Homo-oligomer: A and B are copies of this chain.
Amino acid sequence: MGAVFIFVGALTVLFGAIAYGEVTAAAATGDAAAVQEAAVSAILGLIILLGINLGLVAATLGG
């Protein structure tokens, strides 16, 4: 389970970094609507990511 968890924990921060980069890039623009757009994507993406990680975990540490 260990290798599974740090895989999950590490990919989450890596996904968060990608999402953050998208938000900062949109921020550099000065367009508020662009940032909202990148942010809505990041939020939906992170929610889906939970589903994936939870799915992976439930599937491997379940029976």
Contact = CB atoms under 8 A, between A and B. Distances in A.
Chain A, interface residues (CB within 8 Å), range: 35 or more
Contacts of A32: 26-27, 29-32, 34-35
The SS class assigned to the A binding surface is helix
Given A36-B35, A53-B54, A1 B61 contact: no
A29 B32 CA distance: 8
Interface of A: 1, 5, 8-9, 12-13, 16, 19-20, 23-24, 26-27, 29-36, 38-40, 42-44, 46-47, 49-51, 53-54, 57-58, 61-62
The 5 A-B pairs at the shortest CB distance, nearest first, are namely: A39-B39, A35-B35, A46-B46, A27-B36, A32-B32
